[PDB]
Amino acid sequence: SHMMVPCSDCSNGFERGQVPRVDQLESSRGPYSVKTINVSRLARGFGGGTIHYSTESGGQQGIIAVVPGYVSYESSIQWWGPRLASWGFTVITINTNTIYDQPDNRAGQLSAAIDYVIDKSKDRTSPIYGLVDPNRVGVIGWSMGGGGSLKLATDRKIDAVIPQAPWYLGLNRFSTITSPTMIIACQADAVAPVSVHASRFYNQIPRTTPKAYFEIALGSHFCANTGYPSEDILGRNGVAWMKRFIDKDERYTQFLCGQNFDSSLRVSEYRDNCSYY
Ligand SMILES: [Cl-]
Ligand code: NA
Ligand code: NA
């Protein structure tokens, strides 16, 4: 076997840390200090990126890979890295092999990036040696990368998916997705119109699969990217989503359900099937 460091801040399975306040979830950082490892483009199967991780709480950490869109780089999605790592996930934000790569290719690169992290967790020279649980993985993607994230869920066992402003064209198996999926939609999107992409994909996913549709009022296609004005609230729901579905931490259902999120002028629509969480 490979050495795995126990979680030393866990109970009730993988429930890590204390229950936060909503304002803590909305903050730019959770309770843990974020460390980073640069991954060069020489990495197998993707264009490199950055591993974000924390060590205070020990191991058994879920793994998350995050991918950008067409003609875009890691910075567009990088905010998810430190945000989620600060809550006890090992998170790799990536560049793609080329910026022109299409959704199904981006799905394979998310898969490769997960596997890269797993491989490093078995490498005695890596800071993340023994830190991760290869059995608990999630993905996040923007635009064509969001399409890729949904595609990957149909090809690999994925514990949680966050497609943001997703774009996908053609035949798909989204009608069979069993991974808990939180779609972030940008209301005014002219690149991946929600009526064609995000909303349709949400509606396809099985009723028994936990899901959410978080639509940012007036948002452009870029509305969920690094530095945009909804990092606070998108990150609140995203951290809760990954806690609930990667860590199986049911203390976090309260942050996702019964909230009437679209009462805020910032949120044009919120859908969920909370009765199936
Ligand atoms: Cl747009
Ligand atoms: Na590479
Ligand atoms: Na609203």
Residue numbers in the entry: 21 to 297
Q: What do the study's own words say?
A:
From a previous study that identified new PETase candidates by homology search, we chose the candidate PET6 from the globally distributed, halophilic organism Vibrio gazogenes for further investigation. 24 This enzyme is found in the proteobacteria Vibrio gazogenes from the genus Vibrio, whose members are ubiquitously present in saline and marine environments. The biochemical characterization of PET6 showed that PET6 has a comparatively lower activity than other enzymes but also revealed a superior turnover at very high salt concentrations. Sodium and chloride ions stabilize the protein and decisively promote its activity.
